[PDB]
């Protein structure tokens, strides 16, 4: 009388988020013929769990 | 930026960059085997021994 059990379990996760923020300027004809401002911002987050 | 032809002609670029890349891998394997054998083949003393 022989027997056996197998019980595999496989649970995987992922949370791959992102951000991208940009600003701008460019007030330039009068009292200052030119000055320009722009910022950039990018953020990532990738978290896997198995 | 900046310019003029009368009193105020300049230049500026205060460019900046901030990047921070962090990774964190974390792996954890665990194995655990247990296995046990048994045999018997019995023996009795005769009811009339001395």
mmCIF file with all atom_site columns, C-alpha atoms in Angstrom:
data_model
loop_
_atom_site.group_PDB
_atom_site.id
_atom_site.type_symbol
_atom_site.label_atom_id
_atom_site.label_alt_id
_atom_site.label_comp_id
_atom_site.label_asym_id
_atom_site.label_entity_id
_atom_site.label_seq_id
_atom_site.pdbx_PDB_ins_code
_atom_site.Cartn_x
_atom_site.Cartn_y
_atom_site.Cartn_z
_atom_site.occupancy
_atom_site.B_iso_or_equiv
_atom_site.pdbx_formal_charge
_atom_site.auth_seq_id
_atom_site.auth_comp_id
_atom_site.auth_asym_id
_atom_site.auth_atom_id
_atom_site.pdbx_PDB_model_num
ATOM 1   C CA . UNK A 1 1  ? 0.000  0.000   0.000   1.00 0.00 ? 1  UNK A CA 1
ATOM 2   C CA . UNK A 1 2  ? 1.924  3.015   -1.226  1.00 0.00 ? 2  UNK A CA 1
ATOM 3   C CA . UNK A 1 3  ? 0.897  6.603   -1.779  1.00 0.00 ? 3  UNK A CA 1
ATOM 4   C CA . UNK A 1 4  ? 2.241  10.115  -2.046  1.00 0.00 ? 4  UNK A CA 1
ATOM 5   C CA . UNK A 1 5  ? 1.083  13.713  -2.237  1.00 0.00 ? 5  UNK A CA 1
ATOM 6   C CA . UNK A 1 6  ? 2.635  16.712  -3.946  1.00 0.00 ? 6  UNK A CA 1
ATOM 7   C CA . UNK A 1 7  ? 1.407  20.232  -3.259  1.00 0.00 ? 7  UNK A CA 1
ATOM 8   C CA . UNK A 1 8  ? 3.145  23.010  -5.162  1.00 0.00 ? 8  UNK A CA 1
ATOM 9   C CA . UNK A 1 9  ? 2.228  26.617  -4.456  1.00 0.00 ? 9  UNK A CA 1
ATOM 10  C CA . UNK A 1 10 ? 3.528  29.522  -6.513  1.00 0.00 ? 10 UNK A CA 1
ATOM 11  C CA . UNK A 1 11 ? 2.438  33.064  -5.685  1.00 0.00 ? 11 UNK A CA 1
ATOM 12  C CA . UNK A 1 12 ? 4.007  35.935  -7.615  1.00 0.00 ? 12 UNK A CA 1
ATOM 13  C CA . UNK A 1 13 ? 3.533  39.677  -7.169  1.00 0.00 ? 13 UNK A CA 1
ATOM 14  C CA . UNK A 1 14 ? 4.514  42.853  -8.960  1.00 0.00 ? 14 UNK A CA 1
ATOM 15  C CA . UNK A 1 15 ? 3.868  46.571  -8.510  1.00 0.00 ? 15 UNK A CA 1
ATOM 16  C CA . UNK A 1 16 ? 5.665  48.439  -11.290 1.00 0.00 ? 16 UNK A CA 1
ATOM 17  C CA . UNK A 1 17 ? 4.646  52.064  -10.818 1.00 0.00 ? 17 UNK A CA 1
ATOM 18  C CA . UNK A 1 18 ? 5.996  55.214  -12.444 1.00 0.00 ? 18 UNK A CA 1
ATOM 19  C CA . UNK A 1 19 ? 5.774  58.998  -12.303 1.00 0.00 ? 19 UNK A CA 1
ATOM 20  C CA . UNK A 1 20 ? 6.857  61.834  -14.575 1.00 0.00 ? 20 UNK A CA 1
ATOM 21  C CA . UNK A 1 21 ? 6.345  65.477  -13.578 1.00 0.00 ? 21 UNK A CA 1
ATOM 22  C CA . UNK A 1 22 ? 7.592  68.355  -15.720 1.00 0.00 ? 22 UNK A CA 1
ATOM 23  C CA . UNK A 1 23 ? 7.220  72.116  -15.363 1.00 0.00 ? 23 UNK A CA 1
ATOM 24  C CA . UNK A 1 24 ? 8.006  74.986  -17.712 1.00 0.00 ? 24 UNK A CA 1
ATOM 25  C CA . UNK A 1 25 ? 8.389  78.751  -18.026 1.00 0.00 ? 25 UNK A CA 1
ATOM 26  C CA . UNK A 1 26 ? 9.417  81.199  -20.709 1.00 0.00 ? 26 UNK A CA 1
ATOM 27  C CA . UNK A 1 27 ? 8.143  84.639  -19.774 1.00 0.00 ? 27 UNK A CA 1
ATOM 28  C CA . UNK A 1 28 ? 10.289 86.490  -22.281 1.00 0.00 ? 28 UNK A CA 1
ATOM 29  C CA . UNK A 1 29 ? 9.589  89.464  -24.445 1.00 0.00 ? 29 UNK A CA 1
ATOM 30  C CA . UNK A 1 30 ? 9.313  92.430  -22.106 1.00 0.00 ? 30 UNK A CA 1
ATOM 31  C CA . UNK A 1 31 ? 11.563 93.786  -19.331 1.00 0.00 ? 31 UNK A CA 1
ATOM 32  C CA . UNK A 1 32 ? 13.604 90.592  -19.810 1.00 0.00 ? 32 UNK A CA 1
ATOM 33  C CA . UNK A 1 33 ? 14.027 89.578  -23.436 1.00 0.00 ? 33 UNK A CA 1
ATOM 34  C CA . UNK A 1 34 ? 14.820 86.010  -22.371 1.00 0.00 ? 34 UNK A CA 1
ATOM 35  C CA . UNK A 1 35 ? 14.904 83.699  -19.388 1.00 0.00 ? 35 UNK A CA 1
ATOM 36  C CA . UNK A 1 36 ? 13.575 80.146  -19.329 1.00 0.00 ? 36 UNK A CA 1
ATOM 37  C CA . UNK A 1 37 ? 12.780 77.759  -16.482 1.00 0.00 ? 37 UNK A CA 1
ATOM 38  C CA . UNK A 1 38 ? 11.831 74.080  -16.646 1.00 0.00 ? 38 UNK A CA 1
ATOM 39  C CA . UNK A 1 39 ? 12.153 71.312  -14.072 1.00 0.00 ? 39 UNK A CA 1
ATOM 40  C CA . UNK A 1 40 ? 11.942 67.574  -14.678 1.00 0.00 ? 40 UNK A CA 1
ATOM 41  C CA . UNK A 1 41 ? 11.062 64.738  -12.314 1.00 0.00 ? 41 UNK A CA 1
ATOM 42  C CA . UNK A 1 42 ? 10.667 61.007  -12.929 1.00 0.00 ? 42 UNK A CA 1
ATOM 43  C CA . UNK A 1 43 ? 10.204 58.312  -10.296 1.00 0.00 ? 43 UNK A CA 1
ATOM 44  C CA . UNK A 1 44 ? 9.975  54.548  -10.703 1.00 0.00 ? 44 UNK A CA 1
ATOM 45  C CA . UNK A 1 45 ? 9.110  51.692  -8.377  1.00 0.00 ? 45 UNK A CA 1
ATOM 46  C CA . UNK A 1 46 ? 9.129  48.027  -9.373  1.00 0.00 ? 46 UNK A CA 1
ATOM 47  C CA . UNK A 1 47 ? 8.624  45.517  -6.566  1.00 0.00 ? 47 UNK A CA 1
ATOM 48  C CA . UNK A 1 48 ? 8.272  41.817  -7.340  1.00 0.00 ? 48 UNK A CA 1
ATOM 49  C CA . UNK A 1 49 ? 7.532  39.181  -4.719  1.00 0.00 ? 49 UNK A CA 1
ATOM 50  C CA . UNK A 1 50 ? 7.284  35.459  -5.397  1.00 0.00 ? 50 UNK A CA 1
ATOM 51  C CA . UNK B 2 1  ? 18.550 83.083  -20.267 1.00 0.00 ? 1  UNK B CA 1
ATOM 52  C CA . UNK B 2 2  ? 19.194 86.830  -20.610 1.00 0.00 ? 2  UNK B CA 1
ATOM 53  C CA . UNK B 2 3  ? 19.928 89.504  -23.239 1.00 0.00 ? 3  UNK B CA 1
ATOM 54  C CA . UNK B 2 4  ? 19.658 93.221  -23.960 1.00 0.00 ? 4  UNK B CA 1
ATOM 55  C CA . UNK B 2 5  ? 21.206 95.913  -26.133 1.00 0.00 ? 5  UNK B CA 1
ATOM 56  C CA . UNK B 2 6  ? 21.015 98.795  -23.621 1.00 0.00 ? 6  UNK B CA 1
ATOM 57  C CA . UNK B 2 7  ? 21.907 97.769  -20.051 1.00 0.00 ? 7  UNK B CA 1
ATOM 58  C CA . UNK B 2 8  ? 21.260 94.099  -19.167 1.00 0.00 ? 8  UNK B CA 1
ATOM 59  C CA . UNK B 2 9  ? 22.725 91.338  -21.363 1.00 0.00 ? 9  UNK B CA 1
ATOM 60  C CA . UNK B 2 10 ? 23.765 88.198  -19.479 1.00 0.00 ? 10 UNK B CA 1
ATOM 61  C CA . UNK B 2 11 ? 23.673 84.419  -19.585 1.00 0.00 ? 11 UNK B CA 1
ATOM 62  C CA . UNK B 2 12 ? 22.747 81.731  -17.061 1.00 0.00 ? 12 UNK B CA 1
ATOM 63  C CA . UNK B 2 13 ? 22.031 77.986  -16.952 1.00 0.00 ? 13 UNK B CA 1
ATOM 64  C CA . UNK B 2 14 ? 21.785 76.606  -13.405 1.00 0.00 ? 14 UNK B CA 1
ATOM 65  C CA . UNK B 2 15 ? 21.081 73.093  -14.641 1.00 0.00 ? 15 UNK B CA 1
ATOM 66  C CA . UNK B 2 16 ? 20.766 70.342  -12.039 1.00 0.00 ? 16 UNK B CA 1
ATOM 67  C CA . UNK B 2 17 ? 20.322 66.573  -11.883 1.00 0.00 ? 17 UNK B CA 1
ATOM 68  C CA . UNK B 2 18 ? 19.474 64.293  -8.966  1.00 0.00 ? 18 UNK B CA 1
ATOM 69  C CA . UNK B 2 19 ? 19.208 60.541  -9.531  1.00 0.00 ? 19 UNK B CA 1
ATOM 70  C CA . UNK B 2 20 ? 19.062 57.820  -6.882  1.00 0.00 ? 20 UNK B CA 1
ATOM 71  C CA . UNK B 2 21 ? 18.803 54.221  -8.088  1.00 0.00 ? 21 UNK B CA 1
ATOM 72  C CA . UNK B 2 22 ? 18.346 51.661  -5.319  1.00 0.00 ? 22 UNK B CA 1
ATOM 73  C CA . UNK B 2 23 ? 17.867 47.939  -5.863  1.00 0.00 ? 23 UNK B CA 1
ATOM 74  C CA . UNK B 2 24 ? 17.147 45.363  -3.180  1.00 0.00 ? 24 UNK B CA 1
ATOM 75  C CA . UNK B 2 25 ? 17.091 41.744  -4.264  1.00 0.00 ? 25 UNK B CA 1
ATOM 76  C CA . UNK B 2 26 ? 16.366 39.312  -1.437  1.00 0.00 ? 26 UNK B CA 1
ATOM 77  C CA . UNK B 2 27 ? 16.324 35.559  -2.079  1.00 0.00 ? 27 UNK B CA 1
ATOM 78  C CA . UNK B 2 28 ? 15.699 32.853  0.523   1.00 0.00 ? 28 UNK B CA 1
ATOM 79  C CA . UNK B 2 29 ? 15.651 29.158  -0.375  1.00 0.00 ? 29 UNK B CA 1
ATOM 80  C CA . UNK B 2 30 ? 14.756 26.522  2.209   1.00 0.00 ? 30 UNK B CA 1
ATOM 81  C CA . UNK B 2 31 ? 14.781 22.744  1.777   1.00 0.00 ? 31 UNK B CA 1
ATOM 82  C CA . UNK B 2 32 ? 13.922 20.154  4.414   1.00 0.00 ? 32 UNK B CA 1
ATOM 83  C CA . UNK B 2 33 ? 13.787 16.408  3.779   1.00 0.00 ? 33 UNK B CA 1
ATOM 84  C CA . UNK B 2 34 ? 12.941 13.707  6.318   1.00 0.00 ? 34 UNK B CA 1
ATOM 85  C CA . UNK B 2 35 ? 12.549 10.066  5.411   1.00 0.00 ? 35 UNK B CA 1
ATOM 86  C CA . UNK B 2 36 ? 12.469 6.954   7.555   1.00 0.00 ? 36 UNK B CA 1
ATOM 87  C CA . UNK B 2 37 ? 12.576 3.198   6.882   1.00 0.00 ? 37 UNK B CA 1
ATOM 88  C CA . UNK B 2 38 ? 11.441 0.256   9.007   1.00 0.00 ? 38 UNK B CA 1
ATOM 89  C CA . UNK B 2 39 ? 11.588 -3.516  8.737   1.00 0.00 ? 39 UNK B CA 1
ATOM 90  C CA . UNK B 2 40 ? 10.596 -6.250  11.143  1.00 0.00 ? 40 UNK B CA 1
ATOM 91  C CA . UNK B 2 41 ? 10.886 -10.054 11.201  1.00 0.00 ? 41 UNK B CA 1
ATOM 92  C CA . UNK B 2 42 ? 9.912  -11.259 14.633  1.00 0.00 ? 42 UNK B CA 1
ATOM 93  C CA . UNK B 2 43 ? 11.195 -13.978 16.963  1.00 0.00 ? 43 UNK B CA 1
ATOM 94  C CA . UNK B 2 44 ? 9.697  -15.647 20.029  1.00 0.00 ? 44 UNK B CA 1
ATOM 95  C CA . UNK B 2 45 ? 11.155 -17.945 22.657  1.00 0.00 ? 45 UNK B CA 1
ATOM 96  C CA . UNK B 2 46 ? 9.662  -21.406 22.661  1.00 0.00 ? 46 UNK B CA 1
ATOM 97  C CA . UNK B 2 47 ? 7.196  -21.942 25.522  1.00 0.00 ? 47 UNK B CA 1
ATOM 98  C CA . UNK B 2 48 ? 9.114  -24.972 26.799  1.00 0.00 ? 48 UNK B CA 1
ATOM 99  C CA . UNK B 2 49 ? 12.726 -23.858 27.005  1.00 0.00 ? 49 UNK B CA 1
ATOM 100 C CA . UNK B 2 50 ? 14.831 -24.148 30.140  1.00 0.00 ? 50 UNK B CA 1
#
